[PDB]
Amino acid sequence: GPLGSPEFGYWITCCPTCDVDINTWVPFYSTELNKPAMIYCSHGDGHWVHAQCMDLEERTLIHLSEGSNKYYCNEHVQIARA
Amino acid sequence: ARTKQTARA
Ligand SMILES: [Zn+2]
Ligand SMILES: [Zn+2]
Numbered sequence A: 001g002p003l004g005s006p007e008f009g010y011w012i013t014c015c016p017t018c019d020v021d022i023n024t025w026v027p028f029y030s031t032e033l034n035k036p037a038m039i040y041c042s043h044g045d046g047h048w049v050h051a052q053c054m055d056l057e058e059r060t061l062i063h064l065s066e067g068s069n070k071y072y073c074n075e076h077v078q079i080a081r082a
Numbered sequence B: 001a002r003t004k005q006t007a008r009a
Helices: A058-066 A077-081
Strands: A038-041 A047-050
């Protein structure tokens, strides 16, 4: 989305240890400016998590964005591998 | 995987 509007999908508490907060966030990855980078987790009907909260370094994040494989967040990847 | 805000700066 553009300008000032529905950005709530970005400012959720993506996981129990979510460190991203609308009131304090600043860019970290080279690809960020005013919004946190996110990754789609294929668990169940799927959900989005903050890349930063998954403790992913930039190169890993970039590889994920370029690949066609499914991603499972730290909370669900173990269930997916079982 | 699908991602948001990952376009090269
Ligand atoms: Zn988060
Ligand atoms: Zn997940």
